Structures are given as C-alpha cells and as structure tokens.
Design an enzyme around this catalytic site. Sequence first.
Site, mmCIF file in Angstrom:
data_model
loop_
_atom_site.group_PDB
_atom_site.id
_atom_site.type_symbol
_atom_site.label_atom_id
_atom_site.label_comp_id
_atom_site.label_asym_id
_atom_site.label_seq_id
_atom_site.Cartn_x
_atom_site.Cartn_y
_atom_site.Cartn_z
ATOM 1 N N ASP A 44 6.552 31.170 -17.490
ATOM 2 C CA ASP A 44 6.382 30.482 -18.785
ATOM 3 C C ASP A 44 6.304 31.499 -19.914
ATOM 4 O OD1 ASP A 44 6.317 27.927 -17.444
ATOM 5 O OD2 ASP A 44 4.218 27.685 -17.892
ATOM 6 N N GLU A 66 6.747 21.562 -10.750
ATOM 7 C CA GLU A 66 5.653 22.120 -9.977
ATOM 8 C C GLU A 66 5.376 21.348 -8.677
ATOM 9 O OE1 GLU A 66 1.047 22.123 -11.064
ATOM 10 O OE2 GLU A 66 2.128 23.943 -11.755
ATOM 11 N N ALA A 71 12.664 29.461 -23.915
ATOM 12 C CA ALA A 71 11.961 29.290 -25.173
ATOM 13 C C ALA A 71 12.728 28.311 -26.039
ATOM 14 C CB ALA A 71 11.756 30.610 -25.886
#
Lengths: 264, 264
Positions: free
Chosen positions: A130, A222, A52
């Site tokens: 996430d 990714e 974060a």
Amino acid sequence: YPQPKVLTPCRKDVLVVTPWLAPIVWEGTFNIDILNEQFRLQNTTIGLTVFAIKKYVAFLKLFLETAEKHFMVGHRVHYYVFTDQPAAVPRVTLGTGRQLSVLEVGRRMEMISGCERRFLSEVDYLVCVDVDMEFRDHVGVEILTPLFGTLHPSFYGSSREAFTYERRPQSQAYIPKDEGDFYYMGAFFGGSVQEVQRLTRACHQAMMVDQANGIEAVWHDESHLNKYLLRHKPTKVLSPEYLWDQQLLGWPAVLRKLRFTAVP
Amino acid sequence: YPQPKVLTPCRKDVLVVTPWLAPIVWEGTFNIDILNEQFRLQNTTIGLTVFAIKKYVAFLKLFLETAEKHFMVGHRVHYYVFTDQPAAVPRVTLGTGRQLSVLEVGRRMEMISGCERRFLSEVDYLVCVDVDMEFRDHVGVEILTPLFGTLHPSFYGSSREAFTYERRPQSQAYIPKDEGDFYYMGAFFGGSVQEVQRLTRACHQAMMVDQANGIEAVWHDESHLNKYLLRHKPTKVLSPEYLWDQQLLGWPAVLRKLRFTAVP
Ligand SMILES: O=c1ccn([C@@H]2O[C@H](COP(=O)(O)OP(=O)(O)O)[C@@H](O)[C@H]2O)c(=O)[nH]1
Ligand SMILES: O=c1ccn([C@@H]2O[C@H](COP(=O)(O)OP(=O)(O)O)[C@@H](O)[C@H]2O)c(=O)[nH]1
Ligand SMILES: OC[C@H]1O[C@@H](O)[C@H](O)[C@@H](O)[C@H]1O
Ligand SMILES: OC[C@H]1O[C@@H](O)[C@H](O)[C@@H](O)[C@H]1O
C-alpha cells in the site's frame, strides 16, 4: 560475526518459524551482513509495486523518500508506480542502481498479473505494498523468498475463529472456522516474480468467479490472499514489525523495530 | 491442526533458525502432517546413499531394517548401496514405493559425484549417511531442502575456536580461528540432487588439490564439508536429534527424540 549458539535462542519471546518450517522474520533472527552478501552475489533486483489512484497520489512523496532511506539499500530496486495521474508522481532523487517507472492505469491483482512479461525480464522479486505508508526502519533482503505474507497487526495475538476470513461457502475465499494458520494483511506480500504472478492470477480468477456469482468477499482481495496462502503456504512470514500503526497500536515491547507504518 | 501462535514459541530452549534464516530442525518445530502433504503433492523421491566396504557390510541389515521403519515412510525411496561385496548385501523386505540398488565399487565424494546422471533422473533429493547407524525414530521430509548439514553431536555446545576445523592454510579445507557458524558432521548431509552434486564435486576437487600438495585435512572429507558449508550456507540445519551416540553422550533433556544413532 557473532557465533550463533544452538543452546541460546536469540528470541524466546516470539515464534520464529512456522509449523512448515518457514522463518518468521523478527529483529534478532537474522544477520543482515550475511544476507546482504548472499543477495549481492546474485545481483538481485527487487521490484516494488504501489498503486496511487486519485487522492492517494499525495502519499507518494513520503513513500518514495522513505523507501530510498530504508528499502533494499545497496541492492538494485525498480519501483513500479501504477497511477491515473502520471504528472502527479513526484520527482524523487534516487540512489544508484534504483529506478522508477510510471504505469498509467484507466484491479490490483488484475493489474499486477497483465504487466506479466515486463516483471519477468526486469526483476527477480516482486513486493506489493500500500502507498499510504512510510518506511521508518530497515526493510531488506531478509524478506526475500519464493513467497511471503505479512501478519496483520490487529490479529497476530488472536485465535483463528476471530480471524475475519471469508466465511460464506458461496465465496471462493471461503475458509472454515476450524482452518487457518494466520491472518495475513493484503497491504504487504511478495515473492519471486513467478510466485507473485501465480498468486495474483489465482486471486484474480477467484474474484471473477465470486463476481459472476453475485458475492464479494468480506475483505475483497485480502480475503482471497488469505485463502491462497492457506493452500500454498508462504516460505517466509513477516512479523508485525513490517506492517504497523503506532497511532492505533502503540509500540509494544515485542516489536523491537517499527519498519513500515501507516501514515496517521 | 493446532493453530500456531506468534507470541508462544514452541521451543524456547534451543535456536530454531540460523542467522541466515535457515530452519534448525528440532522436534516441536514442525507439523509433519503439513510437510507430508506438501511433499506428496510433488510425488517426491528421496535417494539414500550408504557405503558398506569390507567389514561395514555387517551394518547393512540393521541399517535397512530400521530405515524401513523410520526413514521417509509414505514417500518414495531409493537406497543406493555402494559396496565391494554385492553378494553380502542382505535381502531386506521393502515397503511399497521403495527400492534398492547395489552399486559395486573397486572416495565417497568422488563416488557420489560419477554416479551423476543416474541420480539426476531417478531422485529429487539425495541423503548421504554412514552405514554403522540405526534409525530409532522418525526421519522424514522435514529435513528436505536444497542443502542441509547436521550439527556434530560432540560440538553443538562449543565455541568456534574449539571446532576441529582444518587450521593449516596450506589446506583447501582451511577455516581461520575467528570464522565459522557450526561444526557439521560428515556422517549426515544432503539436499537436492543438483546441490549435493555441487557439494561433492567441490569437496572432491578440493581434496585433489590438497593431495597434489602433500597435505590431508585433519578430518578428511568432513573438513572439506565444513569449509563448503561455511561458504555455501545450508538451507536447513539438522539438530543433534539426527546424529547421536547414546553410549557416549546419553540422553539429554534438550533431545526430545533420538532419531539416528551410532550402533554401540
Ligand atoms: O482511491 C483509492 C483506493 C485505493 N488505492 C490503493 O489500494 C490501497 C487500499 O485501499 P483502501 O483505502 O481500501 O485501504 P487502505 O490503504 O486505506 O488501508 C491504497 O493503499 C492504494 O495503494 C488507491 O490508490 N486509490
Ligand atoms: O572400511 C571402511 C571404512 C569406511 N566405510 C564407510 O565410511 C564411513 C566412515 O568411516 P570411519 O570408520 O572412518 O568413520 P565411522 O563411520 O567409524 O565414524 C563408514 O560409515 C562407512 O559408511 C566403509 O564402508 N568401510
Ligand atoms: O479484519 C480485516 C480488516 O482489518 C482492519 O483493521 C483493516 O483496517 C482492514 O484493512 C482489514 O485488513
Ligand atoms: O572432531 C571431529 C571428530 O569428532 C569425533 O568425535 C568423531 O568420532 C570423528 O568422526 C570426527 O567427526
């Protein structure tokens, strides 16, 4: 518990096992009472990692609150919050057997693989997600296995040539047009500590090779995750129940539960 | 290879995963090309144990001949033939990477668990079968896993109260009328060396306890196997394709292949 019957499948509408005999985790495929017992007998501890950074601190409160309601309830859990703002981490009240560490950072694959000895001593599994998400329903030990990835919710009905894999052979993430099982999202992967450190170390090494070569993969980590999971096949695959966006994709019939979703 | 599609299951007619997320191995669930590569990368050696005592020596020739045609072809294989007649073991020509040892014996669970150090050094997996059988089709690395059992061909369509589990609570093999996943046959089980030695050691210890108590389980080692696999759930379950009798049960549509069958 209900007796499984070999001539009545529980889900006939979806693929529940991959061609390499890894379960694909859908509601209706698992008896959680059985799984919970197996995992509690081992005193399993699950690590959950979340980044974060900057504005993304604002997502933590809902993320943690909702993890407390739905994520591995009854099991031991260690949240690892990687942030550039340790004073912004909200103080959320946790259930018994659950703890949180705040790790200050000055990337993810790098950061996950040198917190290396720390994860090996403290947890059995690692789950990497996430932060701008919320839990809406059960996410438990059904997902636990040496190595798992999650089907990207935009591409689960798609043919492989439509998959947005890296296509330039210049890139370490390169996957040819006629190869590929699934398109996994980078937002939700995990496994044993040993397997996640292997994966993140490989992705990190591959990204550095692309960097030293002047190329960045089309979808960054990714892309490398997808190349890794092509060559090292996951031992479980999570259905889109585990990574969804109701705003963009609604609530189709084939999803009996929406477990972990994007925040509008 | 063909792209798996998440919204088209390959088999809709049968259960392909157990409620604890173990694959149930049916034709159409696995791509053997993928599995073979994964196993060959590890240089896997598979042990196959067979008892041929008294008249049962007569079954060995067909058993071995047919194993050479269908069992783990391309992989390393070590046959262990337990017999009271070492001169009666037929000399069968083997493929490369395959070997046979003749072990003279003066029971099975005992005999399998103290050949204990021997199996740990020589093989990665152990497969334990009856000798009065023949291979008729592929039996390969799809079955390999820490621990597997096989669905008894007479009882795969049955409800649990019809399962011929041990029902006297006097017996270590005892399973209550409202418990039970499947009825596994004693004729075909296996797993990692470590898991098979655990299972056979447990079954052996449990049989001795029944003996010292004046009770023998209704179906002997198969009773104890079923009690073990209830409490320690298998990581794969083989469908009846892997243990069949065409004479008694024919060839139903739901069996796409008859792989390992009773000799008339
Ligand atoms: O400024 C940022 C950018 C990214 N991230 C972390 O990395 C993820 C992916 O970033 P991006 O916004 O590119 O993807 P998104 O989460 O919006 O789909 C975020 O969820 C965070 O967990 C962060 O913490 N701060
Ligand atoms: O005299 C015997 C009895 C049993 N067996 C071994 O143990 C198995 C089971 O014996 P049984 O005849 O009770 O069962 P079956 O194989 O006929 O179904 C046989 O396949 C052999 O592998 C043997 O070798 N000799
Ligand atoms: O095609 C790959 C991309 O798909 C998008 O829907 C998603 O928002 C991106 O994060 C990335 O996964
Ligand atoms: O009910 C259990 C029994 O079922 C029979 O069909 C079989 O021949 C026996 O070996 C035993 O498995």
